[PDB]
Write a protein that binds this ligand. Sequence first.
Ligand SMILES: [Zn+2]
Ligand SMILES: [Zn+2]
Length: 590
Amino acid sequence: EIRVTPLGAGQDVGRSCILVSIAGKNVMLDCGMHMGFNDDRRFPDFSYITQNGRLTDFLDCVIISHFHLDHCGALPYFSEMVGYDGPIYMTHPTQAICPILLEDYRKIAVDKKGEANFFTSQMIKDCMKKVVAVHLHQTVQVDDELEIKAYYAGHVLGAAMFQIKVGSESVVYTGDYNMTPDRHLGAAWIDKCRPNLLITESTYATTIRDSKRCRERDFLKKVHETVERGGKVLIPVFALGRAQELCILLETFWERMNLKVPIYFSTGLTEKANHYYKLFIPWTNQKIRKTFVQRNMFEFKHIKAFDRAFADNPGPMVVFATPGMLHAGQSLQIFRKWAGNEKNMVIMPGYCVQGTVGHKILSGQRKLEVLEVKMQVEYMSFSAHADAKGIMQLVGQAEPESVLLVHGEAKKMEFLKQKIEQELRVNCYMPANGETVTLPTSPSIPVGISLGLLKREMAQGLLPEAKKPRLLHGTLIMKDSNFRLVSSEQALKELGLAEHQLRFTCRVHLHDTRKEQETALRVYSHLKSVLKDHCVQHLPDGSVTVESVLLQAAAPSEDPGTKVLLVSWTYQDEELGSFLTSLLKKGLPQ
RNA sequence: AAUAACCGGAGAGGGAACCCACU
Ligand SMILES: [Zn+2]
Ligand SMILES: [Zn+2]
């Protein structure tokens, strides 16, 4: 049976972490933190996986979906202080990207919280030394029986679904993923695996994201008119993910329109983001991975590293900035610099954290902290998550038998569950963090078989006698190692046992005046006339043969009015033998 | 679902005597 325990993201978001007990094996999918809980409660609990012992004893392998903090932030914490030496699996881009983000988060924690018990740079290096890489569709054998497979997801560069398969049981964990192709990442694609269980997100289960092409059309019209009006453009987006997508879109449109106004990209994370997005072309969808032959889209002709002192520079400008949340806001610096002007635009392409400067700007009040904002804000949505139609399509394609939702809100969880149960007639759940859910398996045991038996049985099935039970028979030799199904005669020869033969000879008593000499001929004629399509023959010695039943006119008995007919048959044809005896009990025609 | 950490972050260490040579 399958046991699923979400240590986080249970009808919630952040610090995603799932535990799967399958066929007696424990696998930990994803282990990250989440902001907002300055206490240790941000990290996933570990008192349930192993309580207070050694983790490797109970756990089998750790799986990381993608490099977003809320998924890859707990690796140093989970694997260094708590203690873990087991295999950690994660795609090459994830392995290359997560270390930088982890170091940045470590520095941010030092600078803001300064938690005493916090992983250190040396410890991150030690943790990442213990990683193992996985390419697309590469089945990696964690052990002799457990294997993991990856898939292209596209939530960010290198994001991947995972199919954890053992024997016949299999569980597909999607984590964060997108089904709408972006401008640099292809849509997630999967086989028709038909898993028993499917873990998926619901971050946008209640929002049918509209036509992305038209959304970006509107975005580009706004930026064009903004540059025309002479104002400046500030685009806050966190340095990874959406930043590069915006950069590609603007760069291509920009080269096409041949516009010359210089555009700047926030420094700091550029030197690493661009380098990785440049060295990892073989993940970035068809358009880029083809166009790569001539030029390399990530070597930008018109995007240059930003400079702080350019903030005062006149003339219309376009500048990306960090972070998308504005909590600290190097972007917020320029925002405060230009807040007075009404000519400039600003775009917020994502959801802001409620109760922060993000929400204060989200709301339209001028007084946002007491300083008044005057420039114009546009609340765009360029999220790379899964829309309700995306989830429904993905589940339909995978054709699973049970679903399980995490990474979202409880009410949307409920709406999505109701809709999916009504639609696909599939079991669903809603585990709250720390709640274990059990599901029954179908562990069908495999078996060997001899080729010839199957060959002739299939030939018989091919013959137009189907729909009549042919009763596939034989016997199963068991060694406790290699169960092999064999035919009766093959088993007989293999085991050396004697082929016991069971013979029944019935004395039919015929009471009629017909001569004994013609009795056998009468029997032959009557059987040939009655048993249609039966092999009825008259042997030269006066006996009769019906299939394998031999009818012999015995020697004359002491009763003149009674004639003895020995009907001898084997057990296999005993059905026809008994039928012949019953027919003959009625007596021969006279 | 995380953000510019000075980014040419530069002061220097004997001295005391003797002889030579330039005006
Ligand atoms: Zn994510
Ligand atoms: Zn996430």
